[PDB]
Design a protein around this ligand. Structure first.
Ligand code: GSH
Length: 212
């Protein structure tokens, strides 16, 4: 109500927006899209990309999850998900942009097989070690003592990557090699705002498996 969210159930890109809206207490109408039979509404609201998610606020559409998250932060500023200091805001945006590199590494791992899969697993691990060492550090959350937009952007490193790891038979994010990032991902997975708003583990696995 007031806000509509066009999504796809198994997509972390959609889950990101749900978490942000719940952290802001904003009520929304969720519309599930069939990506092989896209609604007329989705095609009208996101003509450029024809992708979910799309947030519609008072009949005006915002596409692209990272753009939507910034819009939510600016439109409902209470309970900030970005810091005030411009430098710390720039560091948040920097690590969100590093998410592009992370998604690419996740994608190569997702698609890898044989000695390719072992390559991509090693490269994903190296990508995550940089994120852990230079991004997260010794903080409980990327946002410090509470989640910020960076935590939301990387939350898929828990439930989603875990499902992919199971399907692939290879675990990359593990406590022995990434103790701080693994603890972060586990803690985020156990947070009610996340745990209540991701698919059941069995459904998530079933999905990634199929996709493969
Ligand atoms: N950069 C976009 C990516 C979103 C995206 O890739 N959405 C996929 C589903 S996870 C999609 O809608 N694909 C349309 C299609 O399958 O043709 C974002 O962050 O919102």
């Amino acid at each position: 109500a007031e806000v509509k969210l066009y999504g796809f159930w198994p997509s972390p890109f959609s889950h990101r927006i749900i978490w942000a809206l719940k952290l802001k207490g904003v009520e929304y109408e969720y519309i599930e899209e069939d990506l092989s039979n896209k609604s007329e509404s989705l095609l009208k609201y996101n003509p450029v990309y024809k992708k979910i998610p799309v947030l519609v606020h008072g009949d005006k559409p915002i596409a692209e999850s990272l753009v939507i998250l910034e819009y939510i932060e600016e439109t409902w500023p209470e309970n900030p998900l970005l810091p005030k200091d411009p430098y710390e805001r720039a560091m948040a945006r920097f690590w969100i942009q590093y998410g592009v590199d992370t998604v690419a590494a996740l994608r190569a791992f997702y698609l890898g097989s044989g000695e390719e899969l072992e390559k991509a697993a090693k490269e994903l691990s190296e990508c995550l070690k940089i994120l852990e060492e230079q991004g997260l550090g010794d903080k409980k959350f990327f946002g410090g003592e509470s989640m910020n937009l960076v935590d939301i952007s990387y939350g898929a490193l828990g439930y989603w990557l875990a499902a992919v790891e199971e399907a692939k038979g290879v675990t990359v994010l593990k406590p022995s090699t990434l103790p701080r990032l693994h603890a972060w991902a586990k803690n985020l997975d156990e947070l009610p705002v996340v745990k209540e708003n991701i698919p059941a583990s069995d459904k998530m696995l079933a999905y990634v498996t199929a996709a493969m």
